[PDB]
Design a protein around this ligand. Structure first.
Ligand SMILES: [Zn+2]
Ligand SMILES: [Zn+2]
Length: 362
């Protein structure tokens, strides 16, 4: 029989519009989301132009409203110049994203003083998330403590990182974190097959001991999120490959396979792709919205999934059990068996729903 799930939420996607529409756009990426059982996405701001000011946010909002097929919220990006300038639009974003390490972005903040400035000026009731690797996790936690507020750590990939977060939680610090499927299901053992172009990702793939540490410490992981980071194969295999993997269409099948193997429970999945995303990002419910999955269907991930313009996947050849059969989004059939059935523009900005505003003290 099928299993009906609530509408799942991916709090970490790169939809490339505006500026990189050859790699993906709102319409292609949201189709990929629906095919992966995802009905709500939070889009990162490392676009061109980057979403680091009110005019760029307004542009992105209209592009998303015209192109998205599922519902969404848009992150604002911290820059070396915009601390203290975001207060009037902060409430309309998913949250504030800080890039603290080298990756596919122009927004790296060089000085910890700039991190402090953002933590002090961004509204304290609104989410802050960080790309923060290895010791950078400890550094940004220290900034969060100094400014007495929470922080969310994106794509945790290392034993070192999950143990540090575990220690912080044991001391009662307000830290949450997410893990991406490639850091649960791929490792150094896969770099031979992938090669140095396809295999380029930040955070980098970890050792078998890193992967085992994440599974052993699943209780520490608040969310799963894809860090869907599409680039074309030509870009991945070029001289200077951008880091990142596409992942919306493979995330849920990989995790369902783990459920079928007893590696985690259905509830574990629903906490990490629905309940905790809702509560960490204050995201609203979606009325008359659900995902029907088939837990029996065995298949092999092909060389590319149907919808992402990335047109490749690092999970090619992996055997999975579990597939998305049907998605209903706000009372309309949005996806069935490889066919997306809602048009670009069906999706809405959840921060403009009355239930989507983040409550705050007057
Ligand atoms: Zn990142
Ligand atoms: Zn990312």
């Amino acid at each position: 029989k099928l299993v009906r799930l609530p509408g799942l939420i991916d709090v970490h996607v790169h939809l490339r519009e505006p500026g990189g529409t050859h790699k993906e756009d709102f319409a292609s990426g949201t189709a990929a989301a629906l095919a992966g059982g995802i009905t709500m996405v939070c889009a990162m701001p490392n676009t061109r132009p980057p979403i680091i000011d009110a005019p760029a946010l307004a542009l992105a909002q209209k592009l998303a409203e015209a192109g998205a097929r599922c519902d969404f919220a848009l992150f604002l990006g911290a820059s070396s110049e915009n601390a203290g300038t975001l207060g009037t639009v902060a409430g309309s974003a998913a949250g504030l994203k800080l890039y603290l390490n080298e990756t596919f972005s122009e927004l790296r903040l060089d000085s910890v003083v700039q991190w402090m400035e953002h933590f002090e000026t961004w509204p304290s009731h609104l989410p802050i998330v960080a790309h923060a690797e290895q010791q950078t996790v400890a550094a940004v936690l220290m900034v969060a403590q100094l400014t007495q507020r929470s922080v969310h750590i994106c794509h945790v990939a290392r034993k070192e990182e999950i143990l540090l977060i575990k220690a912080a939680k044991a001391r009662g610090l307000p830290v949450t974190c997410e893990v991406a499927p490639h850091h649960l299901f791929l490792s150094h053992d896969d770099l031979e097959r992938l090669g140095p172009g396809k295999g380029e990702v930040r955070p980098e793939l970890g050792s078998r001991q890193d992967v085992e540490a994440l599974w052993e410490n699943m209780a520490v992981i608040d969310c799963f999120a894809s860090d869907h980071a599409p680039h074309t194969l030509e870009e991945k295999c070029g001289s200077r490959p951008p880091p990142g993997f596409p992942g919306l269409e493979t995330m849920l099948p990989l995790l369902l396979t783990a459920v079928s193997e007893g590696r985690l429970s259905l509830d574990d999945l629903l906490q990490r792709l629905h309940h905790n995303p809702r509560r960490i990002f204050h995201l609203p419910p979606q009325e008359d919205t659900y995902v029907e999955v088939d837990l029996e269907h065995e298949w092999t991930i092909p060389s590319h999934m149907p919808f992402s313009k990335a047109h490749w996947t690092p999970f090619e050849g992996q055997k999975v059990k579990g597939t998305v059969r049907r998605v209903v989004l706000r009372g309309e059939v949005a996806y069935i068996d490889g066919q997306v059935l809602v048009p670009p523009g069906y999706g809405q900005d959840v921060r403009k729903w009355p239930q989507g505003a983040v409550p705050q003290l007057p």
